[PDB]
Curated annotation (Swiss-Prot):
Protein name listed in UniProt: RNA-directed RNA polymerase NS5
Part of the full-length chain shown: 2512 to 3400 of 3411
Membrane topology: Peripheral membrane protein
UniProt site positions, description: Essential for 2'-O-methyltransferase and N-7 methyltransferase activity: D141
Domain RdRp catalytic: 517-669
Amino acid sequence: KTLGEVWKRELNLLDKRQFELYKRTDIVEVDRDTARRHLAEGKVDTGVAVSRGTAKLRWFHERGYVKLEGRVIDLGCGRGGWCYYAAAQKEVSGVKGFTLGRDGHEKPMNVQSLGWNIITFKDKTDIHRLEPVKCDTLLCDIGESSSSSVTEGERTVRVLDTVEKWLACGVDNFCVKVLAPYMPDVLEKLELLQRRFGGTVIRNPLSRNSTHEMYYVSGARSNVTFTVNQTSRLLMRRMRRPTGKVTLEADVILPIGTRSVETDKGPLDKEAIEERVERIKSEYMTSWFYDNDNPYRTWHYCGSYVTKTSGSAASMVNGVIKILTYPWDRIEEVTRMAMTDTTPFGQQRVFKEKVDTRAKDPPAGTRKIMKVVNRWLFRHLAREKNPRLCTKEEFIAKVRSHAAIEQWKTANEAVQDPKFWELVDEERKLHQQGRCRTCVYNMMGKREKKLSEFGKAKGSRAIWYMWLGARYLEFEALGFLNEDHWASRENSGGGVEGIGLQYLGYVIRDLAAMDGGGFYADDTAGWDTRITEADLDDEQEILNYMSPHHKKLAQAVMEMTYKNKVVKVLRPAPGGKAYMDVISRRDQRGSGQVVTYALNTITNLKVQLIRMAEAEMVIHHQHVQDCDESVLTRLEAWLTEHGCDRLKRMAVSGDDCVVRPIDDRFGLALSHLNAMSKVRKDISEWQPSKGWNDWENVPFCSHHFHELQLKDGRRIVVPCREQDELIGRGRVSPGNGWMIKETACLSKAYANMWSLMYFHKRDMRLLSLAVSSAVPTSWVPQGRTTWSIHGKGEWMTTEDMLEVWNRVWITNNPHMQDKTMVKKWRDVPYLTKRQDKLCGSLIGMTNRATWASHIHLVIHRIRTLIGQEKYTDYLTVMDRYS
Ligand SMILES: Nc1ncnc2c1ncn2[C@@H]1O[C@H](CSCC[C@H](N)C(=O)O)[C@@H](O)[C@H]1O
Ligand SMILES: [Zn+2]
Ligand SMILES: [Zn+2]
C-alpha cells in the first residue's frame, strides 16, 4: 500500500542479475578487497576497518549528522567496526560493545586499531533484555533483511521500542538503524521519537539500494514522512534506471596503538622502587621514554623502553596426533583448542580484562576476621616446624628442573660462576639495608593450551619471572615453606602438597567418607588478581616466627618484592619492535613462583576457614563492615574448638579448593567471600554455589576421579576428565614449523601420560598404543604434557609403561596393601561403558569402529612420513589386535 512496499514487491520480482545491477546503482562504495585480504591472512596490526558499515558511520560522523562523544554504547556491534571507529576518536572516552555473535552471525574481532583498549565487547548477549545504562553516544545497527515488509516492520518497531528505553536515560547523540522506515507503524513510532528526543532519519549513500534502511541520527531534523517518501522515490527512480555505476570513496584505514584513560591509581611507594626503576632506566637509556598513551588505569606506569617483539599467536598442529585423532576433526571442543596468544597484543588485552582491575579493600570487620583466622592458622602451621634459611647448595641442586626464571647462557652455567654469587651477596647486602635494586618481575606470556575465542586464539595468561639471583634470595628467605612441606596434608590438614594426580582422588573420597552436606569446589575468578594487600600483610605473619637475621631477609622479599613490585610487561609498538613498560602496584602476585603455591594454599585455607565460619553462624553479614571483640572472641573459640576439623575437611592446591562442610549452609555464605574479593567464576555475585552429590563428579585440579576394580577385585582411584580436553590438548604443538622428530617425541610423551593416568578410557588407551606404534621405538619422549604441579612426570621415561603403571598404581601406592603386580595390559581394567561414554568416549559410534579397524593404515602412513626407523606393533597388547 505504501511506496516502499511497492519497492519491496518490485525488488522481489527482480532476478539475480537485475538485483546485482540495482545493488550498486549510483551508490557510494569503498573497496574492501585490501582489508578483507588483511583480515583473511590474520593481520591485526594494519589498522584496516573490520567491516563495510564502519565507512557508513564515518560518513555520518564527518558531516555533523552524528557526533561521537564520551561514553559510546554499541547495540549489535557485530565484528565491532563502529566500536573501533568511535574508539579512534579523541572526543570518545569509552566504548561498550554488545552483540549476539552466535549461530551464524559475525563474532567480534580483536585488532590493534587505535583505542582498542577502551572497548569492552560482550558476545552472547540479547540486547532486548539488557537494562539501559547512561551514556553520551548511543549507536545501534541491528536489523535483518527479510522478503516480507511485515517482517521488516515488526523487527523495526521492536528495535525502536528497545532503543527507546536506552534513549530515556538521556543521551546526547545517537545513530539507530531504522530498517523499514516506510511502514506506517514505524513512521508513527519514529515521529514520537522525533517529538521526544529530536533528530531525524537520514538515508546513507553508502547503503546498497537493495535495502530501504535509513538512520535515526541526532544531528539534524526534518519531516519524517516527507524525506522517507523522497528516499523511496529515489530508490524507485534507481530501479527504473539500472546502471550499476558506483560513486567512489576510500576505505577506512585507522591508526594503531593504545590510548590513555582516566586512572584509579592507589598509593605508590616511589622510594621503594626508585633504585630498580633507575637501574632499568639506565640500562636502556637509548630507548627510555614516558609513553603518554599507556593503557594502564589501575597500575602505576613509570616508563617504557624498546625491545624486539616475542611470542606467537599461531598454534602449531601435532601431525601424528592430529592424523590419529581424525574422528574428532569435526568436534568444536577439540578443534577450538589452540595455543595462547603470547604476542604483546594478546598479552596486553588479557592484562586489560583480568589484570588491570581495581581491587576492593576488605572492610574493617572482615579484615579483623582475616587477622584472627590468619594468626591462628599460622600458629597451627608452625606448631612443629621452624622457619629456616635455605642454602646455596639446595638451590644449585634444584637447578636440575626449576621454574620462575646475560653474562651466562644457562642457569647451571651461572650457579657455577663465583661472580654470580658476588652479585647475590651484593643484592643481599642491599636487602639487609632496606634497599632493592635488581629484584624485578618480568611478566612474560605462558604458552598454554586454551579454547579459542571467536575462532581465534585466546590471550595468554602471564607468569612472572625474576632473574636467577632474585629467585635465590626468595628461595633463601621463604623457600622453607616448600622444602619443609608446610602446606603438606600432615602439617595443614587441608593441604595436598606432594601428592601426585594419581593419589589425589583418595583425598576427595576420604572427604566423602565424612558426615556433612554436599561437596563445594568453587573456582575464583583470577585468584592472583584478587590477592589483596590485606592478604599480603596476613601472609607476613611468618616474619613473626623467624629469627632476626632471617626475618630481615624474608621481610625484605615480602615488603620490597611482593608489595612494592616492579613489573615489566610487553605492549605492541610501531614497526616490528615492542614496548617494555615498567608498572607497579601493591595488591597482586604472580603464579610463576614456587613459593606462590604455598602462600596461595595457606591464604586459601584462611579464606575457606572464614567462609565456613560464616556458614556456621559464628560470623555473618552484619559483621562485614565492622566487628566487636565479642564476636571476634567467639570466632577465636570456634577456631580453638573445630579449626583442625574444618581444615581436614579441605583439599586445597593453590587457588583450587574442595570443601566438605558440616552442612549446605556453606553454599550461601558469600558475604565475607565477596568482601575478600574472592569472587566465584561463572556465577552471579550472590547466587548460591553449585553443590555436588556424587564425590566422583567433584572437580579438583582440572580433574574428577573414579573408583575402579582390578581383575582381582582390588580397588584404585583413577583420574578422569573430558576426553575432548585430552585430545584437543594432545593435538597442539608449541614450537613453530617443527621437525617431525620433535613432535613425535612429544606425541610419545602424551601417549605415555595417557597410558599412565588415563588408561581406563578406551579411546585413550587405543590412542596411546597407536601413537607408540607409529613413533620409532628407540625415540625418547620429550616436551611438556601438563602444567599441574601434581604431574610428577613419571610417564616421561623410556621404560615400559606397564612397569611404571604397576609402580605408581601397585608398587608405590600407599592405599594398595597387596603389592601383587599386574602381568598383561589386558588385565588392566577400563571404566564402565556408561561412565566412559559419560566422560567423552566415542564407543558405540560407527565412526570409532571404522577408526579402530583402519587405525593400522594410518599408523603405516605416519611411519612412512617419519621415515625409515625401527618400529614396534604395540597394538597386539589389546584383545582385538592379536
Ligand atoms: N539480536 C542481536 N543482538 C545483538 N547483536 C545482534 C543481534 N542480531 C544480530 N546482531 C549482530 O549485529 C551485527 C550487525 S552488522 C552492524 C555492526 C557493524 N556495522 C559491524 O558489523 O562492524 C551482526 O554482525 C550481528 O552479528
Ligand atoms: Zn632485590
Ligand atoms: Zn570420568
